[PDB]
Design a protein around this ligand. Structure first.
Ligand SMILES: NC(=O)c1ncn([C@@H]2O[C@H](COP(=O)(O)O)[C@@H](O)[C@H]2O)c1N
Lengths: 109, 85, 315
């Protein structure tokens, strides 16, 4: 039953677009493929942590997303955490809480 | 370096014969939560998997989410049961 | 020098030991932690406890990223008993299936069952701090919560349960072996006025024995007075996980019939016996309480895990 990231099947950049549109909806900002005049499936999203925003803090959470082929037609959207960060100067939350957000978004397109 | 607008090239369809994503490496094949190896004790977590999302179906209408994460020198894999709305 | 003084000194060591260790030193080197979102419906949570084999889950308020209390089996024990003593309507009880955890805890706040103070210790503070709380209250488990600096988020590290610290000190202390003073020479456990039940007893009448007495379990005795079994409060999960709240109208016998084989057991000892032995118990078997009996398994008393943690924690 337990397996990394979120399963997805279909067309290479059709899920990548799914994954882009889902990111917009949550608010998270994201990096964009730089065409060379494959890494386009490596997205670095910067999410605003809502339990900080509404308090006033500008602390963000940083989530890289990776897509892999698992077998022909079948893919995994891996989702890693690169920690959290304030503007001025570990744990699985808000990270798990935001994967919750993203996954809800992916599923309701 | 972060953008809020959805990237254009995707919209308009099968555009250039686009570059393929990488295949799944053996490291993300096996998730330690598949283990009855005290039934909270887990196998030592991988060095590299730390901070990677894991998911499972519940048959119950909820999302099950987990990550393993370090805490000082011991490891905490934490499983989340949570609604959709 | 002697038995009553070798024990007095070994006692002196095992306390000193636990001031010197953190709650953290107790947790496995690598372990899981199930968490329930406080917005979960009750039915769901109960299915999730059964399916994961667990009797408890710490609660996450994902909204403010805080810990919204602890879901033990005591919650269900407290609502039904209230519903039974307050409602003129026997079926009113089935209504706690609409409720989300949040809303069950709201009923529990109102009744005075759930303290306003949400109880917690920091993991890197002494193991003592976990013992004194659980003891000052009669809780039988305690959350270890730290707070993430860069976010103000509450990192929920683990849950620490009487048995696991008692299993811990059993294993990591030689002095458990030097505790050879028999129970009949100690001021420990309950010996007069035990709450009991027979198979013919109704389950709703056990479970409130549980609430009122504030006890984890009730033993089941026969007419000759001999111990047969125990209806635990965790046994309540196995009665309502199907959302048939009228299984609370069964006899204990009828109820125990539905109990599955995944059962830690009913543990005994002579009043002659001593602590050194019950530590050997809790070191290997999953013990939760010892029942003092005699020649013919007649019940003479109850030595409980808190009974023993508190005997050793207090100077
Ligand atoms: N059947 C009983 O009366 C009974 N069961 C437990 N107890 C006592 O009540 C206290 C709480 O027990 P526990 O924490 O195991 O629920 C302990 O001091 C224990 O000796 C009782 N008196």
């Amino acid at each position: 039953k337990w397996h990394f990231g979120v399963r997805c099947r279909g067309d290479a950049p059709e899920i990548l677009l799914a994954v882009y549109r889902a990111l917009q909806r949550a608010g998270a900002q994201f990096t964009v493929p730089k065409p060379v005049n494959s890494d386009m499936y490596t997205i670095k999203s910067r999410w605003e942590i809502p339990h900080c925003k509404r308090e006033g803090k500008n602390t963000y959470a940083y989530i890289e997303l990776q897509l892999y082929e698992v077998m022909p037609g079948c893919f995994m959207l891996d989702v890693k955490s690169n920690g959290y960060k304030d503007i001025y100067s570990k744990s699985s939350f808000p990270f798990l809480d935001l994967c919750a957000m993203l996954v809800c978004k992916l599923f309701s397109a | 370096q972060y953008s809020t607008e959805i990237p254009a090239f995707l919209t308009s369809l099968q555009e250039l014969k686009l570059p393929k994503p990488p295949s799944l490496p053996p490291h993300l094949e096996k998730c330690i939560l598949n283990s009855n190896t005290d039934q909270s004790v887990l196998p030592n977590p991988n060095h590299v998997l730390l901070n990677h999302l894991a998911a499972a179906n519940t048959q119950l209408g909820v999302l099950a989410l987990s990550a393993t994460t370090r805490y000082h020198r011991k490891y905490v894999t934490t499983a989340m049961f949570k609604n959709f709305d | 020098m002697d038995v009553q003084e070798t024990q007095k000194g070994a006692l002196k060591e095992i306390q000193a030991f636990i001031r010197s260790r953190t709650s953290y030193d107790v947790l496995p080197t690598s372990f899981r932690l199930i968490v329930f979102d406080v917005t979960l419906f009750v039915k769901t949570s109960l299915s999730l406890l059964t399916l994961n084999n667990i009797v408890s889950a710490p609660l996450w308020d994902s909204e403010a990223n805080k810990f919204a209390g602890l879901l033990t089996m005591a919650d269900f024990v407290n609502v039904i008993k209230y519903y039974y003593q307050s409602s003129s309507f026997p079926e009113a009880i089935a209504e706690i299936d609409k409720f989300r955890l949040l809303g069950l805890r709201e009923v529990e706040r109102k009744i005075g069952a759930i303290p306003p103070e949400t109880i917690y210790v920091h993991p890197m503070h002494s193991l003592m701090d976990a013992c004194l709380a659980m003891s000052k209250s009669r809780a039988r488990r305690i959350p270890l919560i730290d707070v993430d600096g860069e976010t103000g988020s509450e990192m929920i590290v683990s849950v620490l349960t009487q048995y696991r610290i008692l299993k811990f000190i059993s294993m990591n202390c030689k002095e458990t072996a030097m505790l050879r003073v028999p129970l009949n020479q100690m001021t420990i456990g309950t010996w007069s006025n035990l709450a009991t039940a027979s198979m013919e007893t109704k389950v709703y009448d056990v479970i409130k024995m549980l609430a009122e007495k504030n006890i984890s379990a009730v033993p089941i005795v026969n007419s000759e007075g001999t111990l047969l079994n125990v209806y635990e409060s965790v046994d309540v999960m196995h009665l309502i996980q199907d959302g048939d709240y009228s299984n609370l109208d069964l006899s204990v016998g009828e109820a125990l019939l539905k109990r599955p084989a995944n059962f830690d057991g009913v543990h005994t000892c002579r009043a002659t016996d001593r602590l050194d032995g019950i530590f050997d118990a809790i070191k290997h078997s999953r013990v939760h309480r010892l029942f003092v009996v005699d020649e013919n398994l007649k019940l003479e008393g109850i030595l409980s895990l808190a009974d023993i943690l508190n005997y050793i924690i207090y100077d």
